[model samples]
Target: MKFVYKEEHPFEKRRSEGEKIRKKYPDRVPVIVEKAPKARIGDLDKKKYLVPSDLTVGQFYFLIRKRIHLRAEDALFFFVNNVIPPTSATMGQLYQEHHEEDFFLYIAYSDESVYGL
Candidate 1:
């Protein structure tokens, strides 16, 4: 999981442009970016898989969100903006039912609040 602190978001400065969520908090919004390994590399990871382009993007993220925990606000923002919904049933199921969708998306963490305070 990667936490791109809200301070690091490219959108942080363009509040007037609409990406100013960071300004609302006036602090670091620890965004969690997570991904599943594609393949088994030695002991820690395997090769990563790509997201299919058929299934509803929301469902794909639902799978990911289940494995990893994130604040709802953060998840919604990512799903709405970042996902590229998959296509094959195999791929969609992999993401929804299996150990797939182990991919990355930015999210908010419980500890994220610590950055600003």
Candidate 2:
């Protein structure tokens, strides 16, 4: 199979847009992410992120995927307090419910294989 090399591809400003979000929302919230027990890597697996409060969970997923260097087709899921949050939910909403004295939302995520029987 031969794949042609194409030099022209349209690009969205998501990278700069995200930076704009960062600046627009100066008061970004902190989130602590932990992988599932079986999926845990080493200390590297546990990470902290500062995300805009207005970013939807769906958009956040893509941000995380990029940060983790995962392919777009990879599977990643996140849960808060053992409950799966809807993709439309905003980070602010999650922080409102989860952040207490700690001031950080604790999120547990699972990585699944794209194929299964």
Candidate 3:
């Protein structure tokens, strides 16, 4: 399946939506996580998430893994703005460094098999 958020909404619309969400929740960081195109894992039931600024990427990664009910033996990888981020970084730090023009941090995930490892 395709990345539904980008596939269904245009950039302009997405930007506006992001701005509205940000305005409504100024203290939280807006994030969009989707399964990578080549990923074997299934899509997340929900896409958009508002996370506390202090939450670390490691914590968020754990949440995502739990949300998907992923097997403990399997590994998942996250790419923020198409690049891997430091797990120790806070959501606020990542937002400041990598948020797109839409004002949302876009994250894509894939299983270890995608890398043929």
lDDT of each: 0.32, 0.62, 0.83
User: What would the per-residue lDDT of candidate 3 be over residues 8-90, giving only the tens digit for each residue?
Assistant: 88999989988998899888899989887667886798889999989999899889989999765678888875577778999
Model 2, C-alpha of 38: deviation from truth (Å): 0.5
In TM-score terms, candidate 1 sits at: 0.25
Please, what is the TM-score per model? Answer: 0.25, 0.62, 0.85
Please rank every candidate by lDDT, starting with the best. Answer: 3, 2, 1
List pairs with backbone clashes in candidate 3. none
Q: Give the TM-score of candidate 3.
A: 0.85
Model 2: number of backbone collisions: 0
* Local distance difference test, candidate 1: 0.32
**lDDT for each residue of candidate 2 in 1-117, tens digit (9 for 90 to 100):** 010111121124333433454456666866766666565432234366788789899888777767777766776777776677888999988888875343556676666433221
Evaluation by TM-score, superior candidate among 2 and 3: 3
Which is the leading candidate under TM-score? 3
Q: In candidate 3, what residue range of length 10 has the lowest lDDT sum?
A: 108-117
